[model samples]
Target: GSPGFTCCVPGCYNNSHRDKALHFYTFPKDAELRRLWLKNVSRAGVSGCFSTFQPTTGHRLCSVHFQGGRKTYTVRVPTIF
Candidate 1:
């Protein structure tokens, strides 16, 4: 047997038999990550030009739709940086 890292999510491995069973997903494009970074920086009133690095990546939303009482909206923002 080979050594491996454990799952980070709690109760993930307990429910499964595989020792190293894990959930994995692809990262979003670099452009999207940069856009979010800038947006956060602007909101915080930070003054500086920031860029994304190799190890840094954006999130991939499982669902883009949000629902409220008799109303619904999709979270989709065009990213250009």
Candidate 2:
């Protein structure tokens, strides 16, 4: 099976295979931004997936989550679910 990326947000099910039109973004190397990303996901009532959770290089968030539907330096955090 070819590897596919999945959104790390707890409730989101978007994956690379089916939602090809969507783009996936790797976690930011900036620690504050990364923590904000995870923190926002947690704000959406995510608990089970984030207990002691730390995002590695493979962890991704789909384009749907960002403010502009794509990750950019200005629109960095994944705010939507």
Candidate 3:
């Protein structure tokens, strides 16, 4: 449905496999960060749903898979000084 692969993050290669996946593992302190992360992921054209795993050792994990050549990107914000 997309013209060509255009990932938001430039240096990263696009994953085209329908079964390809994205996993986000975060610490309890990163709960807010995780929320923002998913937000950005969606903004990058990642329409697939994600699953959140319970915290183990004060952390949680979110996993998602990209389908087709729809192009998906991920961004990480640096901690404020």
Candidate 4:
């Protein structure tokens, strides 16, 4: 089987085996940034379990989940669902 990298966001089926052009970014190492990413994902209604949600290094948000459908120096956060 091909190693697959699935987008962590809910309802998004983008995965490494399927989406070759998409870029995936791992959760930031900083706790602050990590929290922000979690909060945004929660805000996007990905899940109702906000109390238990936590993003780890292995968790990744796809590029389509960000502004302009891509990340840049200024667009570090995952803004879209």
Candidate 5:
């Protein structure tokens, strides 16, 4: 079997091969874009997640973090009040 990865968003629930087509995005390779990604995670207070600590290549976050809250992976989260 192949290995799979889960979303790194704190309080998120999207896992590999879920019943939906949630998109998984790799962390940016560019230094500037990667910094923005880290900043967003840190700003959201989800940076302390053990699985995502200083995440780099192959690390992923679900699409839900970039969009609506009522999504499968979002749990009870909304993108800012």
Candidate 6:
């Protein structure tokens, strides 16, 4: 798959080897959500199946852009946002 990913934000320094403050996430299939991710970083998306399409492995985004701030799987905390 991907070696790792930099933050979706263009000017952001967040990456796998850098700051651990922001957690990464994958692009959602939902059109609206995906659109938001795109806007999250105007120059971030690579425009592959992951951007104009659904996530397939190498795709990713970061928690910094999400308003809801996703949750981790702890004690069966099932979530979709």
Please tell me which predicted candidate would have the highest lDDT against the true structure: 4
Best by TM-score: 2
The candidates, ranked best first by TM-score, are 2, 4, 5, 6, 3, 1
Candidate 5 residue 51 Cα shift, in angstroms, is 8.9
Poorly placed runs, candidate 5 (over 4 Å): 1-5, 10-22, 42-52, 68-81
Model 4: per-residue Cα lDDT over 4-52, one tens digit each: 4355445453743345356567777797788786655543325364422
lDDT of 3 by residue, 1-81 (tens): 323222232223332222124433343355676655434333324444443221222322233323232224542431211
Query: Measured by TM-score, how close is model 3 to the native structure?
Result: 0.27
2-74, model 2: which lDDT tens digit per residue? 3433554444546433453455667677877777765654432243543332344345566456544445657
lDDT of model 4 at residue 51?
A: 29
Weakest 10 consecutive residues of candidate 3 by summed lDDT: 52-61
lDDT by residue for model 1 (3-79), tens: 32221222322111124344323333676664553342222212333432212232221111123322235533322
TM-score of each: 0.20, 0.47, 0.27, 0.46, 0.38, 0.37
Which one wins by lDDT: 2 or 5? 2
Residues 1-81, model 6: lDDT tens digits:
244444444444464324446556666668666656554533324544334222334345554433344543341111213
The Cα local distance difference test for each model comes to 0.28, 0.52, 0.32, 0.54, 0.46, 0.44
Write down the RMSD of candidate 2 (Cα, Å). Answer: 5.5
lDDT tens readout by residue for model 5, 1-81: 224445434444464324224666566558666656554444332534455333444445566554444345453232221
Native-referenced Cα lDDT, model 3: 0.32
